[PDB]
């Protein structure tokens, strides 16, 4: 079909209720994909949640280093535009997985981290603080970490981090964006802040280079973000948007992305919004 047609269908499917029914039909995990390393004894407590585990085939491996991390490569192709948006989708680091987290950032010299969670919710820890408050310095896995600046806006915090390999003295800089107005299992507190945020992340991409995206589990809020960025790329190029196909393609790479029907409904309505704005 066309962008125009796909959007008529989405509009009708949201009134019809069929869009949600089909979302609830979709598999959460791709059947037949091995999940083995994540379940080994030495790796079980490296998972924040027992039911959110990487597939063997797309799990992130550390360079020259056997340590397991709950993280997955998620690549979203738009072939009609010779385009691939790369991500690494991961959970919120635990106290004892911060070393592996920063090792991924260093291995691939990732310049952008997107964190879609507060550190705590209702008196419970959702993510370990894996960076120091300025001006303090932090040791993780043989990396020294400092926050060179920190600025709060309405919906998110923008931080610049310096990562130093202690043995070599080689330095790497990373932009860190923490979206604090988006509860676990829910939708963004404000759709317009969300859409501005997503477009901002797009503008900070460097081609070829994955964006590291995480929340608490790294599937619900991360899935919504990935869906929306994909839809934005498609709408600007007058290409058809089928959100169910987008969700499935993510779930083929990390199970359960986009967690709730409310999240899916949210992102579909946001997709329609942006389409109506673009003409």
């Amino acid at each position: 079909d066309t962008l125009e047609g796909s959007m008529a269908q989405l509009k009708k499917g949201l009134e019809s209720g069929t869009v949600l029914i089909q979302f609830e039909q979709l598999y959460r995990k791709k059947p037949g994909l091995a999940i083995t390393f994540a379940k080994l004894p030495q790796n079980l407590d490296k998972n924040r949640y027992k039911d959110v585990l990487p597939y063997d085939t797309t799990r992130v491996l550390l360079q020259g280093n056997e340590d397991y991390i709950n993280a997955s490569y998620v690549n979203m192709e738009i072939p009609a535009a010779n385009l691939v948006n790369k991500y690494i989708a991961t959970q919120g680091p635990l106290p004892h997985t911060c070393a592996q987290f920063w090792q991924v950032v260093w291995d691939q010299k990732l310049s952008l981290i997107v964190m879609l969670t507060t550190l705590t919710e209702r008196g419970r820890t959702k993510c370990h603080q894996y960076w120091p408050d300025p001006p303090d310095v932090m040791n993780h896995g043989g990396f020294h970490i400092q926050c060179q600046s920190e600025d709060c806006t309405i919906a998110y915090v923008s931080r610049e981090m310096l990562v130093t390999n202690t043995q070599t003295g080689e330095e790497h800089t990373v932009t860190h964006l923490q979206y604090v107005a988006w509860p676990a299992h829910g939708v963004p507190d404000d759709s317009s802040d969300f859409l501005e945020f997503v477009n901002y992340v797009r503008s900070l991409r460097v081609d070829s280079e994955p964006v590291l995206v995480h929340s608490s589990a790294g599937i619900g809020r991360t899935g919504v973000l990935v869906t929306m960025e994909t839809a934005m790329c498609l709408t600007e190029r007058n290409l058809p948007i089928y959100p169910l196909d987008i969700v499935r393609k993510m779930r083929d790479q990390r199970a359960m992305m986009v967690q709730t029907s409310s999240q899916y409904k949210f992102v579909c309505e946001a997709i329609l919004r942006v389409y109506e704005e673009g003409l």
């Binding site: 079980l44 407590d45 998972n47 924040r48 949640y49 027992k50 039911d51 959110v52 608490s216 589990a217 599937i219 619900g220 359960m256 967690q259």
Partner: peptide
């Protein structure tokens, strides 16, 4: 260990 979906 806890489940996220719970």
């Amino acid at each position: 260990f806890s489940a996220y979906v719970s």
